[PDB]
């Protein structure tokens, strides 16, 4: 038999220094870390869509009841949960006429129609932000359903509906968030179906996105996103040792320029003088030529890690003692040597490779349930498996639908303690601010870095992008 | 359509579903043959849906 070790489930911090294994339950009982007096909300979209948003905001004002509270906690109400006033009165509304939103939609060229559709919203958003006295913390963009059907790649308009830029990505959300970066406007898009879905009907008569049993978690994951984008601290980690920067490298393809050019994006996570946590991005996108290199050249690698060591230095004072660069791609010696030189002598430089490709599936002997979340099969001092997705008793179920797939965590470069590395990535799986779930299947560095990469590679004209996640997720 | 006591080929409306596996040899952890499980469908039990 092969030994299979289990790591303690990481705990996250809430108000008053109280710690709780779960995020929803910790928020519901203890409340956010910081005091956010109120969320001045700006809404943009069609007048037919403003009523639905107002209805949903009033709906989440009252508590929401889900099918089974044991499987997933209910939502006690926004102002009770977050101690933050978010009313449907005081929203700054910008109207999008149906004729204007339909003129651009029915175009033969996907790139042109997406560019015009994004421009129609962003121009009004910039005008409201720059030439209006009202203050808006965050901007909700409610879009109709037909656009989503015909605003993403490979969307073929019906021949009957066609009535009549190439440097911009054909994705509505990506281009939308990309073109608003230079103005630093926190925006967060809603679809009409994500709204009061009960209006949208299928052929049978059931809602397409029937959320009847799962309204509570919907409110949970919308309220937390609104709170984060408005400038709140939902929760934080408490087990992260002092002096550890993490950084997560993700490589993304850019199709606009000839050859993908493989833009790379990074995110940092560390501590602060005291107990504060710092989780921002490190957006200096370092393009990598060649079609499929995914290995960063020495000059860009040195620039990246030099920026990372500085961005730690000005905010803490001294250099990190051990940086754990997680990366979905394997490190070759070329970039590692470049990393080493800019790295000082005291810093322990560690390069960790994480992968889901390895086909390992532990099936329990008896029972219709998956393995417990947190099991770690350590192959050797440098390589191991960790089940980030699995059964955890508090959620009463497993985070997967079928049997989950582990994360193949190997210390590619440096030495590192395998148990300590496995004890930290599992903690990184809990700081997902875009969604208030029990934990994420992959570490948030490898996920938020991929998000900012997908956003930064939608527009060619990005210059000095913001390093805050509010403008990206 | 069932080995041992356990069914492998079943019916679902007009689609006959079949359990299938894919194998791949790997030596890095140990001398191992990895197996992945998949489900396929046919319209008449012999020709796969294209």
């Amino acid at each position: 038999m092969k030994e299979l070790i289990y790591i303690e489930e990481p705990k996250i911090l809430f108000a008053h220094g109280q710690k709780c294994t779960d995020a929803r339950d910790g928020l519901a009982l203890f409340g956010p870390l910081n005091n956010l007096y109120g969320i001045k909300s700006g809404v943009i979209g069609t007048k037919q869509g403003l009523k639905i948003f107002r209805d949903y905001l009033d709906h989440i004002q009252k508590p929401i009841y889900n099918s089974n509270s044991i499987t997933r906690p209910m939502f006690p109400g926004f102002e009770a949960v977050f101690d933050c006033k978010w009313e449907s009165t005081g929203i700054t509304f910008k109207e999008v006429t149906n004729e204007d939103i339909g003129k651009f939609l029915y175009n033969s060229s996907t790139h042109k129609r997406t560019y015009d559709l994004v421009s129609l919203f962003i121009d009004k958003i910039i005008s409201a932000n720059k030439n209006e006295d009202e203050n808006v913390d965050v901007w909700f963009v409610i879009v109709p359903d037909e656009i989503y059907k015909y605003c993403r790649p490979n969307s073929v308009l019906p021949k009957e509906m066609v009535q009549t830029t190439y440097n911009y990505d054909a994705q509505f959300h990506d281009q939308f968030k990309a073109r608003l970066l230079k103005h630093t406007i926190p925006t967060q898009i809603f679809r009409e179906s994500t709204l009061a879905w009960r209006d949208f009907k299928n052929a049978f008569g059931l809602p397409i996105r029937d959320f009847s049993k799962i309204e509570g978690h919907l409110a949970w994951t919308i309220s937390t996103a609104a709170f984060y984008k408005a400038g709140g601290k939902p929760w934080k980690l408490s087990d992260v040792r002092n002096g550890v920067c993490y950084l997560g490298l993700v490589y993304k393809k850019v199709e606009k320029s000839k050859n993908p050019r493989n833009a790379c994006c990074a995110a940092q996570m560390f501590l602060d003088n005291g107990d504060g946590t710092v989780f921002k991005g490190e957006v200096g996108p370092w393009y990598n030529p060649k079609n499929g290199q995914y290995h960063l050249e020495p000059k860009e690698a040195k620039a990246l890690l030099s920026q990372s060591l500085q961005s730690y230095k000005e905010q803490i004072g001294e250099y990190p003692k051990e940086v754990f660069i997680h990366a979905k791609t394997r490190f070759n010696h070329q970039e590692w040597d470049a990393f080493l030189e800019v790295t000082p002598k005291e810093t322990n430089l560690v390069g960790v490779t994480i992968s889901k490709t390895k086909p390992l599936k532990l099936y329990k002997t008896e029972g219709d349930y998956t393995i417990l979340r947190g099991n770690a099969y350590v192959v050797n001092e440098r390589s191991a498996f960790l089940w980030t997705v699995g059964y955890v008793p508090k959620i009463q179920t497993a985070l997967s639908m079928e049997v989950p797939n582990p994360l193949f965590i190997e210390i590619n470069k440096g030495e590192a303690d395998i148990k300590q590395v496995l004890k930290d990535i599992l903690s990184l799986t809990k700081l997902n601010y875009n969604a208030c779930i029990f934990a994420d299947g992959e570490p948030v560095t490898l996920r938020f870095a991929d998000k900012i990469g997908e956003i930064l590679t939608a527009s060619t004209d990005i210059k000095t992008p913001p390093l805050a996640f509010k403008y990206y997720i | 359509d069932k080995f041992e006591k356990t069914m492998l080929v079943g019916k679902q409306k007009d689609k006959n579903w079949h359990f299938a596996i894919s194998g791949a040899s790997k030596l890095y952890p140990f001398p191992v043959l990895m197996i992945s499980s998949h489900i396929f469908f046919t319209a008449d039990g012999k020709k796969l849906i294209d």
Partner: peptide, 16 residues
């Protein structure tokens, strides 16, 4: 090649 799958051993369990 063995027809019986490789078995590991977990020190932690749970119940419904």
């Amino acid at each position: 090649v063995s027809n019986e799958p490789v078995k590991f051993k977990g020190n932690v369990s749970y119940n419904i």
